């Protein structure tokens, strides 16, 4: 396989490298501070005022529950980043898989020291959105419930609606009955809304003295017929374990009651149905850290994508497809950590052939149940008179069905910038990939800054054209303005993973390690086999 | 006799006064649990012979509300 | 089965009565005129500016594209009412169900009047939720695409993420590829997003001298390598139809290019998939719109449910299961319009009886294959410390494990008050019910308006409280004052409606007529056999 | 896992335990050596007659035909005990499951000796049951043939009716064609009815000049038409092998007959097809014997059954579901020689909370396939004028449509008393357990002695109470008293295994490794999906 080999190009003393590199960690410490705040929840402030009450802290009670030394993938942690007026914390929820009785979990809980833990709009959406990833990746789930309720001013947006608050039980109760277990651990309030989440799940726990369900809490219960009743009283621990049956496990404290889940992990009698032909995990031929300085500083400076893929892949080796052909996509096969897998890389414009190429790519892997892995850096489809007249428009329709149709599991890592019908070709975030993620140098948006700019402010001055007039570089130059600002804010990894059309921003020089975690979670869950619709030929 | 609170709730409302002669079910007096008003009438025509619920009176379920004689 | 019949216990001369029927008929008649001026566009204005390029209008194009006199079901005609700043009627794009060469299909354009027929986010959410109508119910897709792009200042909510636009393509090829076909009239501009549309599609047919799909329109590709050309150059009718291959048919104008479309679903070998033991259809026995005057005009003032079924159902005929058994909670079959249907209306608060007694019903319903519809008029779960101690809390649990998973056709209507749990137990919005109805009377909420504002006030005055202080009236009075009057505010269906929480306000009159509609058009596709998660005992 | 330990509460060395240690091992004994008299077959009378003919012995040809050391488990032979007139061992057939070329084979061997190997009707009976152990757990089948004919003075009792004889064949046939191996040795004669288990069977094997294989011997030929000729002419050995082809291995004698059946269930190609996550056997932590003295010997003296349990189960580790609710019901997870199991052991009454404890609990093994062990020990269904009310009637039925229903293995143990709806409930004999075993001190009846002698004599007083008369003390004593021993008699293991309601009586002290063989043995066949019927909620 010495001919499979990706001989570097790159020269890593090389002072452009160290260039690109500097801003590069730069940007990577600027994720790890603020990822670092975020763990504070609702700051030292209330979080003491937490621990106080003899609970155990929501991060650490993962790490308790997590198998000793295993690794953990947390999943949107910019969660509502300067969303909401407040700051919220992670959303008020953190969530992630990891190992738990040698089964890879998807693991749900609350911040109470967040805005009372109660469900913020986006906080549902997170709750949820590590519910699909559970469905999809076949993860049994464990809920560490301790939740106040949902964000009554913001209930609008949080309880009506299909994918509101509610399709959490929905979404519980599919699983059950898709075999995918549902384990609840109480530990804390569970008023009303969160009263579902341990009523509706396979095995519950309860820490006594501590933990409470009750669909109407003292405030409410007080509100209707009168009555006033303690909360251990109304719905405690021992009344949900000795009495009604909403529990099964009486915990001792969140020790305890963590530790009783773990057992409930370990009679699951769990199997993977993934399987593929998976071999010798070998590393790369070159530090991922070099990754730093590949990718240029300057945003719109071309690079070899083949750079990114050498220091990813298995002992470097990867056979290009149509080597030759719409270069502007690079498409070839590799293993990572043993799994085997399909690269579908940018490589900049996108003409028609690059669609062809790369949805005849999507059609072997499919064929042979090869996971899909896809890197954007995308900027948009080469447009122009004769370019369109060529079909650069149906031949771009044949790579989307192909990647919206692939059954395989699929992985997208934004690595430049998703532009465009860009994104939706590259498999985005509407097209279901099991698991999307951002690095901090990539951009998205829906075309570039000053390019929107461009024709929402040519369009006012063409309306204003035939209108008798004519559009002076003095409004037309305030129309631009804060659409050039708009764009350049929105564009941003934070304020992405803030409202998760992203599962999180990452590092650059990790992305091997996380890919290898997230393929092997993924094969807890049958690789499918692919039906196509038609295509225009 | 009586009905008394059918149910657990907040009285808003208690039209037949101390005394007066009932009819066939006249909401003697009316509760409200949860956003929902629970008039409880009267099953057997008579005279009320003493209420004990001036509106507002959040009382239980059981708790005496009007009586027959 | 003189006894399986409803007796009215209903004066329709009575003074109570027509008091009712007069605030209920009000209330029609407020959706019935703003209705109408949602009818107008993009107004009179651009509106006529329309008729003038030569171009039939929207809602003129689907009439004329339907059957001789067929009907036609629009959804959520109050779509972003009051939403966005300005007015953007219908959301810039009308669907509905209506017959075409004989077979129910899911018709969607675009008003070019509606702000250019862009996409605003909420043009996206409805565009979508008809495609899920369009799936869920197998009805083949008809798309008039006559739009200019997405609504390129409120993008970061049009572009990205999974149910955002781009969606729209995923969901396009799944239904070609599950046999759905999809087909495509372009009758207007055409550019970048909506440019798939078009391309993605079984069959597509264009306008001479009108139509346009290009991926970048002039604005773009002269802001591309300079370059100018025309519209008609770039990607007209006659470059698509003669040299690239984007589009099938060639068509001479509206009227034409509707007239082909029909001839598509002609030859479509269409076969409906349902099948249920339906027998001759018996109307009512009694007058639909005596309901006007059934319904309460006293907001909280308990009626009987069993006289809104006695006014749908076929021959008034009811068979009620668990007849005295938590009365909360209405139970039985009977049919309409000779379907067979399930039927469970709320008739008041929900204790645990009523969770058992519908869970229970629903089994049945969900293994004889009837078609589920519920009746909402929930007002919540009975609280209290005996009511919690009494698995109030696991029971209704049981409920909704049996919604959440039953795979007959389910169908919603809010005849009354969607609040808290109650929604969830009833098949909300988020149980995929295959259509969801709200009547102009019905309120949804989290929960009451006060009961908000008194538990969020409470717990101020208890934070305040271990703090050595306490809540005067004054700061009291002033946190309840705002949410009060939120909750009046985000109650009422034109709120519920504009944001898609529901596929309409309907008239309380017609509601048998559109559910017989509804539920004929769901046999397209077939009734799944149905599996329960775990019931928690 | 050191918390999932049972510390046990029994003292080996107390006088209490060492009581009923004392009376328990004496049952035991009391049973070994009946199981001996019962390895007599026809006595040693006829026994030693048929060994004149060269003819190895049932019992002998059985641990010849094993694999080398192989264990063998007996099915019922207690068969046929004090049933018919004369003694017929083991109802004249022997059967079991034993190693045979690597593969747990399902054996049956007439015993020639006893009554003439002719059927009685618990012959058929038994060779009925030895198929469904063979079908129900997909083991291959070897037949050691050596029988005169149906007992034809009981005929009425084993030839018409379903699963009378006739249905060995019925039985065979089906096999065959789910693909379990049917293998047929004739070592004697096999006149008429037993002439078809080797007509009927994949491969055949004949002893020459000892073996016959005919429709009508010689009595019957003579009685034909006259006709006068010897079994070996009519249907020897040398006519269906060189002949007929009624035969298909002609073999010398008892032990080479043997070792040609060894060969055919060598070239099986057969492979297992059951699966579960097994991990490394533990043994507990208790000595297995330690269980005669956890057994109280006052048959109605409470004892705690979570010590029987920590006597069985690997390294004592038991996770207890729904710890502290309907405690009358024990249930929990925990693996057995590796196998992971679901255990629901009785502890007392049973009221509704167990019952539901139960159901739930069935949901959550049925839904992790994972196999059902009971350990039945009920005195019945707490009775009361409030516990009726409260629908002790229905979440009774809630239990037994989950044992009704569940498709994983299920494994039943009598180890105090089956009595009433507790036997049904906790899946009785009529619940297809793979197998089902009775300890010593284990009593099985509708219920208790003068329990039955209360009520049959009530009636009998108020029927003659509202017949102006009353029940003397004379009457009544006499209506009670044969009753009162019927049921003490009807009572006894020995009475149940004699008919089959149990597929034997086994050592209280051996329950582990007879269950580890079961089990094991039940992979043989893949654990089915389980579908639930309705459950009245
Ligand atoms: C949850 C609860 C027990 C809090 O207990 P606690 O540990 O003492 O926490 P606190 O009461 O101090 O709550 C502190 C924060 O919770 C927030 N909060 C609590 N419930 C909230 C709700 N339902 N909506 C919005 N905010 C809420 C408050 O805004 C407060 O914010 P602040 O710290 O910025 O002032 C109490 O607030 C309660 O009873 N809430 C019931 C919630 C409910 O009824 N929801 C039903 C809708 S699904
Ligand atoms: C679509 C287009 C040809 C309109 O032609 P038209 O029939 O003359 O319509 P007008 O130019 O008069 O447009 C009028 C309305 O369209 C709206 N509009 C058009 N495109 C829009 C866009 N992409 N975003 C926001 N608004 C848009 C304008 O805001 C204007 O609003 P107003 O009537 O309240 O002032 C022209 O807007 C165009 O070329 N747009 C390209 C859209 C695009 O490039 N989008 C790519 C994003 S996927
Ligand atoms: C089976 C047979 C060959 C026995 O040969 P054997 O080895 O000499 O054994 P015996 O003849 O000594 O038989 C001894 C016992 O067999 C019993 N026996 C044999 N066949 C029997 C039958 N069909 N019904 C009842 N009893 C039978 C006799 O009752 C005798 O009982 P006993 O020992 O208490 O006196 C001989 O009985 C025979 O020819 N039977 C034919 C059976 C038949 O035709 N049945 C068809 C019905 S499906
Ligand atoms: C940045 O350069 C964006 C390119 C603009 C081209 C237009 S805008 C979005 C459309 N989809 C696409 O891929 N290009 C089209
Ligand atoms: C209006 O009256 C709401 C009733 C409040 C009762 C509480 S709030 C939501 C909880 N779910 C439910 O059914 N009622 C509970």
Same mark, same amino acid.
């Given at each position: 396989?010495?001919?499979?080999?990706?001989?570097?190009?790159?020269?890593?003393?090389?002072? +452009?490298?160290?260039?690109? &590199?500097?801003?590069?960690?730069?940007?990577?410490?600027?994720?790890?501070?603020? #990822?670092?705040?975020?763990?504070?929840?609702?700051?030292?402030?209330?979080?003491?005022?937490?621990?106080?009450?003899?609970?155990?802290?929501?991060?650490?009670?993962?790490?308790?529950?997590?198998?000793?030394?295993?690794?953990?993938?947390?999943?949107?942690?910019? &969660? %509502?980043?300067?969303?909401? /007026?407040?700051?919220?914390?992670?959303?008020? *929820?953190?969530?992630?898989?990891?190992?738990?009785?040698?089964?890879?979990?998807?693991?749900?809980?609350?911040?109470?020291?967040?805005?009372?833990?109660?469900?913020?709009?986006?906080?549902?959406?997170?709750?949820?959105?590590?519910?699909?990833?559970?469905? +999809?990746?076949?993860?049994?789930? *464990?809920? #560490?419930?301790?939740?106040?309720?949902?964000?009554?001013?913001?209930?609008?947006?949080?309880?009506?609606?299909?994918?509101?608050?509610?399709?959490? $039980? $929905?979404?519980?109760?599919?699983?059950?009955?898709? !075999?995918?277990?549902?384990? &609840?651990?109480?530990?804390?309030?569970?008023?009303?809304?969160?009263?579902?989440?341990?009523?509706?799940?396979?095995?519950?726990?309860?820490?006594?003295?501590?933990?409470?369900?009750?669909?109407?809490?003292?405030?409410?219960?007080?509100?209707?017929?009168?009555?006033?009743?303690?909360?251990?009283?109304? /719905?405690?621990?021992?009344?949900?374990?000795?009495?009604?049956?909403?529990?099964?496990?009486?915990?001792?404290?969140?020790?305890?009651?963590?530790?009783?889940?773990?057992?409930?992990?370990?009679?699951?009698?769990?199997?993977?149905?993934?399987?593929?032909?998976?071999?010798?995990?070998?590393?790369?031929?070159?530090?991922?850290?070099?990754?730093?300085?590949?990718?240029?500083?300057?945003?719109?400076?071309?690079?070899?994508?083949?750079?990114?893929?050498?220091?990813?892949?298995?002992?470097?080796?990867?056979?290009?497809?149509?080597?030759? $052909?719409?270069?502007?996509?690079?498409?070839? $096969?590799?293993?990572?950590?043993?799994?085997?897998?399909?690269?579908?890389?940018?490589?900049?414009?996108?003409?028609?052939?690059?669609?062809?190429?790369?949805?005849?790519?999507?059609?072997? @892997?499919?064929?042979?149940?090869?996971?899909?892995?896809?890197?954007?850096?995308?900027?948009?489809?080469?447009?122009?008179?004769?370019?369109? %007249?060529? !079909?650069?428009?149906?031949?771009?329709?044949?790579?989307?069905?192909?990647?919206?149709?692939?059954?395989?599991?699929?992985?997208?890592?934004?690595?430049?910038?998703?532009?465009?019908?860009?994104?939706?070709?590259?498999?985005?975030?509407?097209?279901?990939?099991?698991?999307?993620?951002?690095?901090?140098?990539?951009?998205?948006?829906?075309?570039? !800054? +000053?390019?929107? @700019?461009?024709?929402?402010?040519?369009?006012?001055?063409?309306?204003?054209?035939? %209108?008798?007039?004519?559009?002076?570089?003095?409004?037309?130059?305030?129309?631009?303005?804060?659409?050039?600002?708009?764009?350049?804010?929105?564009?941003?990894?934070?304020?992405?993973?803030?409202?998760?059309?992203?599962?999180?921003?990452?590092?650059?020089?990790?992305?091997?390690?996380?890919?290898?975690?997230?393929?092997?979670?993924?094969?807890?869950?049958?690789?499918?086999?692919?039906?196509?619709?038609?295509?225009?030929? | 006799?009586?009905?008394?609170?059918?149910?657990?709730?907040?009285?808003?409302?208690?039209?037949?006064? =101390?005394?007066?002669?009932?009819?066939?079910?006249?909401?003697?007096?009316?509760?409200?649990?949860?956003?929902?008003?629970?008039?409880?009438?009267? =099953?057997?025509?008579?005279?009320?012979?003493?209420?004990?619920?001036?509106?507002?009176?959040?009382?239980?379920?059981?708790? =005496?509300?009007?009586?027959?004689?």
């Amino acid at each position: 396989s010495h001919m499979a080999i990706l001989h570097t190009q790159i020269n890593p003393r090389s002072a +452009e490298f160290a260039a690109n &590199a500097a801003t590069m960690l730069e940007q990577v410490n600027a994720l790890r501070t603020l #990822l670092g705040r975020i763990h504070e929840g609702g700051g030292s402030a209330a979080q003491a005022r937490h621990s106080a009450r003899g609970k155990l802290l929501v991060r650490e009670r993962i790490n308790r529950l997590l198998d000793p030394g295993s690794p953990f993938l947390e999943l949107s942690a910019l &969660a %509502a980043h300067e969303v909401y /007026g407040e700051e919220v914390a992670a959303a008020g *929820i953190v969530a992630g898989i990891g190992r738990v009785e040698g089964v890879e979990c998807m693991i749900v809980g609350n911040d109470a020291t967040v805005k009372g833990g109660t469900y913020y709009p986006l906080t549902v959406k997170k709750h949820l959105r590590a519910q699909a990833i559970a469905l +999809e990746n076949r993860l049994p789930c *464990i809920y #560490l419930v301790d939740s106040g309720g949902a964000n009554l001013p913001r209930q609008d947006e949080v309880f009506p609606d299909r994918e509101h608050f509610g399709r959490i $039980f $929905f979404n519980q109760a599919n699983m059950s009955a898709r !075999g995918i277990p549902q384990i &609840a651990v109480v530990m804390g309030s569970c008023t009303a809304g969160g009263a579902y989440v341990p009523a509706m799940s396979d095995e519950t726990v309860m820490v006594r003295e501590q933990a409470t369900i009750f669909l109407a809490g003292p405030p409410l219960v007080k509100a209707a017929t009168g009555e006033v009743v303690s909360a251990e009283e109304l /719905g405690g621990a021992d009344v949900h374990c000795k009495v009604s049956g909403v529990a099964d496990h009486y915990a001792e404290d969140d020790d305890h009651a963590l530790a009783i889940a773990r057992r409930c992990v370990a009679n699951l009698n769990w199997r993977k149905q993934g399987q593929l032909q998976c071999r010798a995990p070998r590393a790369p031929l070159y530090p991922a850290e070099e990754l730093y300085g590949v990718i240029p500083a300057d945003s719109k400076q071309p690079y070899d994508v083949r750079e990114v893929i050498a220091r990813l892949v298995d002992g470097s080796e990867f056979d290009e497809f149509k080597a030759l $052909f719409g270069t502007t996509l690079v498409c070839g $096969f590799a293993h990572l950590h043993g799994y085997p897998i399909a690269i579908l890389a940018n490589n900049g414009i996108l003409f028609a052939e690059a669609a062809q190429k790369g949805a005849h790519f999507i059609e072997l @892997a499919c064929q042979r149940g090869i996971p899909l892995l896809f890197l954007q850096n995308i900027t948009g489809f080469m447009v122009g008179q004769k370019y369109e %007249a060529g !079909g650069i428009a149906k031949h771009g329709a044949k790579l989307v069905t192909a990647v919206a149709c692939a059954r395989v599991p699929k992985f997208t890592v934004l690595i430049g910038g998703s532009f465009g019908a860009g994104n939706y070709g590259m498999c985005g975030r509407a097209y279901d990939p099991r698991f999307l993620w951002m690095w901090p140098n990539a951009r998205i948006g829906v075309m570039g !800054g +000053e390019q929107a @700019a461009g024709v929402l402010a040519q369009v006012k001055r063409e309306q204003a054209e035939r %209108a008798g007039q004519q559009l002076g570089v003095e409004e037309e130059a305030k129309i631009k303005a804060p659409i050039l600002e708009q764009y350049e804010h929105q564009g941003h990894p934070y304020y992405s993973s803030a409202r998760l059309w992203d599962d999180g921003v990452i590092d650059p020089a990790q992305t091997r390690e996380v890919l290898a975690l997230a393929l092997s979670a993924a094969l807890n869950a049958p690789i499918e086999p692919t039906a196509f619709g038609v295509f225009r030929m | 006799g009586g009905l008394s609170a059918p149910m657990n709730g907040s009285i808003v409302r208690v039209l037949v006064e =101390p005394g007066q002669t009932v009819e066939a079910g006249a909401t003697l007096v009316v509760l409200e649990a949860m956003k929902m008003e629970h008039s409880i009438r009267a =099953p057997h025509a008579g005279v009320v012979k003493a209420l004990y619920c001036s509106e507002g009176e959040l009382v239980e379920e059981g708790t =005496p509300l009007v009586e027959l004689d």
